[PDB]
Structure formats: C-alpha cells, structure tokens
User: Fold this.
Amino acid sequence: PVYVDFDVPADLEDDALEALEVARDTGAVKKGTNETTKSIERGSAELVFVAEDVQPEEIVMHIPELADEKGVPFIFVEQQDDLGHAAGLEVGSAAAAVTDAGEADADVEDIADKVEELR
Amino acid sequence: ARSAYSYIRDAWKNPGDGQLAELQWQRQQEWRNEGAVERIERPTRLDKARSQGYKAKQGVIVARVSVRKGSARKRRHKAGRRSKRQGVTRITRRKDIQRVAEERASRTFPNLRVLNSYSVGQDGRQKWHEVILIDPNHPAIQNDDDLSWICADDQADRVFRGLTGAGRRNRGLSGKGKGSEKTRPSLRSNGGKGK
Amino acid sequence: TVLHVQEIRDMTPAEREAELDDLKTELLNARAVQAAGGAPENPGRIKELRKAIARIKTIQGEEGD
Amino acid sequence: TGAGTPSQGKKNTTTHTKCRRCGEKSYHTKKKVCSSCGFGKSAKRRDYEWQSKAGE
Amino acid sequence: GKKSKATKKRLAKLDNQNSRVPAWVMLKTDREVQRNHKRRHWRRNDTDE
Amino acid sequence: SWDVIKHPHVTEKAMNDMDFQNKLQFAVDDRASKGEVADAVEEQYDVTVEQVNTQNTMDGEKKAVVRLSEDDDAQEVASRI
RNA sequence: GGGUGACAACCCCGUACUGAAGACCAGUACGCUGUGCGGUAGUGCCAGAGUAGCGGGGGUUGGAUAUCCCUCGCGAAUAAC
RNA sequence: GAGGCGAAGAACCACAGAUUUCCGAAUGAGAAUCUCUCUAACAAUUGCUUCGCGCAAUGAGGAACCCCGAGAACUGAAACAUCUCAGUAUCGGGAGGAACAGAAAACGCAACGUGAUGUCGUUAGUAACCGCGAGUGAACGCGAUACAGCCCAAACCGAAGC
Ligand SMILES: [Cl-]
Ligand SMILES: [Cl-]
Ligand SMILES: [Cl-]
Ligand SMILES: [Mg+2]
Ligand SMILES: [Mg+2]
Ligand SMILES: [Mg+2]
Ligand SMILES: [Mg+2]
Ligand SMILES: [Mg+2]
Ligand SMILES: [Mg+2]
Ligand SMILES: [Mg+2]
Ligand SMILES: [Mg+2]
Ligand SMILES: [Mg+2]
Ligand SMILES: [Mg+2]
Ligand SMILES: [Mg+2]
Ligand SMILES: [Mg+2]
Ligand SMILES: [Mg+2]
Ligand code: NA
Ligand code: NA
Ligand code: NA
Ligand code: NA
Ligand code: NA
Ligand code: NA
Ligand code: NA
Ligand code: NA
Ligand code: NA
Ligand code: NA
Ligand code: NA
Assistant:
C-alpha cells in the first residue's frame, strides 16, 4: 500500500495470474522475493508479480522502484496466497517473476501494455 | 547480486526517510494501542532477524515489546543520605531499554528462551523492540544443528543472567583488550566495578 | 501358624481377595476383643495379621490382580 | 486508663494461628498471611539474609 | 469460641501428649527415661490454638 | 484405602445403649458419612440399620451410634465379636 | 588405633600383604563410519546500522583530555572500506 | 510384663521394586492441614497443535559457591560536603554441579615480536586517581595450571528440507 501507486482491476489480475500458470508449465518462473529480486537485477525478468497483502511491507517495497530502473514491468495481485498458488506452490508468495513467458509471451506483452496504461 | 534482504536493511539505516518513514508513522498508531508484549507472526525487519538467528520454522517465535523512554523511575530517599546519594532526576538504570524489553518478553513466554532482539524504532515516549524466542522443548529445534545449543539445561533463563547478546554488550564484554579489566569474566567476580 | 509368601503366590487372584477379606475380618475381631480388653490368645497375632495383609496386597500388585 | 495492666484485659482477639504451610503459629487469620513463612503472600518461602550474621 | 474439625484434632493430640511416661517404659529403660518434658497445663501453659 | 469401621466402642454408656436402645457404638473413620457407616455395619454384621448418629470426639476419632431394627438384637450381635 | 574386670604386637576387633565390588574420571581418550583439506588466475558478487562515531546529562572505574555503562539528541563508510 | 518371629535361613547390610493419608510450588474451587461439585478440573502463563489440555514447558527447594539487576549508613578523613566505609550490608531476578568467560575490529617488553578464555604466582602498592588531603589502585608482559577449536547471516543454489 505504501508501495502501491496504482489499482489493478480484477479482470487484469485474473489474466495475469492465468498467464503466470501457463508460463509456469511452458516456460520459466521465479518464486519468492529474493529470487524475484535477483532476476530483476540480472535482467532476466520479463514480468514481475507483487502481492498487496504483504505484512510487513518491507519485504516487497523496494520492488517497484527497482523494476522501474531496470525497465522491468510489474503488476499487483491482491492476495499472496493466489500468487503462490498460480506459481505452483502449496504456500503463498509475496513476489514472483516470469523469466521465460513460454506460450503466454504474447499475453505477457499485452498485460505489460495494459499496466503501463494504468501508469 | 544484492539479496532482497539488503533492501530491508538499507531502508532501516534511515527510519525517518522514504517509504519506511510513512510505514512507521502508520504502524506506530496501531502499536500504541497494542499491549506490552505482542506476539507477531512475522518479523518487521526480516534481514536483521535472520542475521540474528531467526528461521521460519516450528518453535521460533517473535514478539514486539514496548518500553518507556528515559531515566530511572526512582523514589527519593526516605531516610538520611549524604548529598551524593540524594539524586532522583539524573539517575539512570544500568540495564539498557533493550534488555528490559527482552526480560519482559521472556517472562511473557515462561517456557521459551531469548535468542536475540533488535530495535523497531520509537516515538517520543517509548521504544519498541522485537525479540526472538525459541522453544527448547520442540523437536524441530532439538534437531536443528544451528539452534539446538539453546536447548541445554545451562541455557535456562539465559536473558536473566545477561547471556544474551544485548546482555553481553551491556556488561562491557565487547572489548577483549584495554577497558575490559573489570568486565571479563563477570561484573561480580570483578567486584561490581565494571560499570 | 504363619502364611508364607509362596502360598500367597500359589493362590488364584480370587483366592487372594477372599483371603484378604478373611484376614481383615480376623483383625477387626481382634481389635474388637482388644476394645473390650479383652485379653487375647496372643498379642503377637494382630501384628502378624497386619503383615499378612500387607504381603497379600504386595503380591496382588506384583501379579497384576 | 492505664496503658499497662488495665488495657491488657481487652485482648480476646485471635490473630496469629497455626499455619497450613509451615506449621508455625504465624498465620494471621485476619490478613490471611503467615508472618513466619510468607504463606498467602509469596509462593516462594519467606527468607532473609539478615536472619543470620552477615558472614554466615 | 467455635472450633473447626482440624482444630479439634490438634487439641485432641495435645491432650494425648499430656500422658505420663508409662510405668513399664521406666523399667525397660532402667530409669533412663522418667520425665515428660512436653507436659502441659491448661492454665499455666498456653497452646498454639 | 481406609476402612469405615475401626472397632466397637466398648464403654458403660455403650452397654446401656446396647441393652436398652438396641444401638451399637463404633469408632469409625472420621472421613465417613452416616450412610457409609450404616452400609458398612449392615455388610459386616448382617443386620438392618435404622439410624446413625455421629460425633467427632476429643480422642481424634469419629464415634457412630448405630440403632438397629427390631428384627435385630444388639446384645446378640455384640456377643459374637 | 580400639575393646577386654589395671601398662596387651601374640585374649577379641582390627593393622601389613594380597584380592573383590561400587562410584567418579567419562559417553571422555583411543578406535571407527561418513564428509572432504588445499593451491593458481580472473571477477569492485557477498560479508551483521540507530551500529562506528559526535554532542547534552549522569553513574562507574586506577583510567588520568586516555575505563566501562545508562539516558536524550544527532549520525557514517562498504573491504578500492 | 506378656507374647511372638527365625533352618520354609529371621535379625541385620547393599541394590532394585511395592505401598507412600492431609497440607505444602500446590495447579478444579474455597479453607489456619479442612471442605465443596457436573467423579469434573495441567489453576495461571506459554510452545506445538488433529485447535481437544491432544502433546509438552514454567512455577518451588537446596550449605554456601555462581550470574544479572537495586543499593545504604554507622565509620575513616581525628569536624565535614567530594573522597572513604563500598559496589560492602541488605533487597529484586535467575542457572549449574559448578557458574561466568572464550577463539581478537586483541596485545603494543614497537617487533623480523606475542597469539581464545579463566585461575594461581609475579609484575606492584608500580602506572593511574585524589579537599593532589586522608585514602584509592590496575594492565601488558613473565613463570605456571589446563589447553580446542568451531557454527551462522549473505553471496551462488532454490523445495533438493524439517
Ligand atoms: Cl507492515
Ligand atoms: Cl530466557
Ligand atoms: Cl608480547
Ligand atoms: Mg526457572
Ligand atoms: Mg570466575
Ligand atoms: Mg504505649
Ligand atoms: Mg512460635
Ligand atoms: Mg484425660
Ligand atoms: Mg452433629
Ligand atoms: Mg566512586
Ligand atoms: Mg487447592
Ligand atoms: Mg570524621
Ligand atoms: Mg561521612
Ligand atoms: Mg583534612
Ligand atoms: Mg574503590
Ligand atoms: Mg595493557
Ligand atoms: Na522464558
Ligand atoms: Na566502571
Ligand atoms: Na491457657
Ligand atoms: Na480407637
Ligand atoms: Na553520552
Ligand atoms: Na516413602
Ligand atoms: Na504442567
Ligand atoms: Na489444548
Ligand atoms: Na574523627
Ligand atoms: Na561530628
Ligand atoms: Na576526592
């Protein structure tokens, strides 16, 4: 919420989470804030996911600004438990990155395009 | 490359700047309405906690403790004293606020032992610390090669004997050289002159 | 006559109980005779009634009665 | 009225009684506190270093 | 006053403690045991009840 | 683990209660109620108990005064034991 | 050394010698199983913050401008440090 | 005094077991050692948790010793205030058979040197403090005792785990 500057409509979040599941199976994903952070810094991140229910906010709050200076686009998801499940985990995940979008690569670019429009 | 953890660390170098400042200003509002000792499900500073031995695992517990700021809450002499001993206002306790916080947490959790603690900031009237405690009786701890030392009988009530990290620093044990003549091996064996 | 420990072990669990009851009864009657005072056939008997009772209860516990 | 013998006549009040915990007749039945062992005040037993000479 | 059952037991015991050393105990001990030192009078002494 | 009946209380007052009132007197465990005394007396002596009166005495024991039904004869019951 | 109706190596217990057990040393030492130590070159990838440090007020110390500690305020660098 | 036990090996001693009332940290609740009830209670705090007191923990004691806090005054200075008595007495909290300390952001006989810690002997009433009065008072080193060195956090891995 201090790190959240724009609102994502449920439909967008649905499409992004869907894209994430397919990118999981047909492509590469990083789960967890440390691995996500690494991929932004290493440049291998295509799309970055960040949950809004993260307590404390410290875990994830560096991500937007970091992603911005690495040119990596990012999207907000409401509950970390969905983000973790979408990424293939029994537990939640505060952040995730798509490294290889796989078959969802067309959809990823479009979701990126939709979010830049949310500014 | 930088760990994500390094970002939490870096934020906390300046608690009155940037996003963290906003965070604190919001959070403290809730903290001031909370009790003396509050068990929290996750550490506010994850880097510091892991640095201090915290693991996300059964039998590891974190609690945030509020303690009043400033000097000794001290009653004035009720009988004869030489002038040197008549003070009230400027007298300060020999245990730092952090150790007070650690003792209050440990008392709240009589079965648990204090591993370590760290500062989460302060308002004008009080300071908050988060204290990591460990269940010495839980087999997830008893089998952890990194934490199982704390299960030994001689580690019972470690905080109250000054065996904690804040305990040891506050006892003047930091230096191995000059200045430590009256602290090591203990304040008491040196006749209470260490501080 | 003295009740030995092998004889107590040779008893069935129900024989020990019935022997326990009998021994209590003799004791009760001995303490009744005493309360009349009421000289006994021998005072050495009440003492032995107590140890026999103790023995049986010990064996009952040992055997799992 | 004299504070001596004449005032001794009014003392029919029971205070200190045999204590359940230590057995001393120190249990003050009005305070519910034992003055000898601390029962009713303290879970720990009442004890003081001044009860003996300092060096023993 | 009004005694409780426990108080009553304690008073009962103190009365029992007021017995003499039995004659036969003096014979058994060759008179090494004669006086009862805990001997208590209701008037002259004071109980803890 | 304690028994109810300790022993008959045998004194002159007890004899008068036995002869004239059809009552038996016992030293009983001070933890025992009147009902428990009535029962125990019935089970041991094979009689019928009409009434039990109790007293905690200055000997430190409980004394029970147990009146027997007319079908029972106290002096007879007492003479057995 | 003691006992025994009075000064006892030889009257009795014991005492020297030799031997046995338990406890502590110690779940230690030795032994063993698994693991794998280390070196060169390249690489600013990592290395613990209200900290180090400074100021106000106190306590403490032999610690003196150079002890250790508390309290209020301020406050770094990143091993090329 | 009476009476009993023991060759069915008693007494007695060692080890192991059984029994072990009530109060007592005292824990279902109350109570000067007793009582009450839904035969029902780990009370209270807390960890895990099949979220059920299901599995566990704490409480209190102990001759002093040990560690962490609070901390006088008589007295000495021939008065007395800093100083001294003294971080003593006493108080609060807590561990163990010992405790605490402990593998250098050390030392600084300055070195081409020493090499975790404690303790003992010495260094030395030396350096240092102090109405520079009275008093106070180390350390490095050395000779000994005993010796023992290691694990994380992070980087890089990323569920390979408990
Ligand atoms: Cl938060
Ligand atoms: Cl503790
Ligand atoms: Cl050297
Ligand atoms: Mg304890
Ligand atoms: Mg020591
Ligand atoms: Mg007066
Ligand atoms: Mg008394
Ligand atoms: Mg009488
Ligand atoms: Mg009545
Ligand atoms: Mg001083
Ligand atoms: Mg109770
Ligand atoms: Mg003077
Ligand atoms: Mg003076
Ligand atoms: Mg002078
Ligand atoms: Mg001094
Ligand atoms: Mg030095
Ligand atoms: Na505790
Ligand atoms: Na000091
Ligand atoms: Na009297
Ligand atoms: Na009787
Ligand atoms: Na300061
Ligand atoms: Na016993
Ligand atoms: Na318990
Ligand atoms: Na439970
Ligand atoms: Na003088
Ligand atoms: Na004077
Ligand atoms: Na001075």
Observations:
- Chains E and C do not touch (no CB pair under 8 Å).
- The two ends of chain E are 11 Å apart (CA to CA).
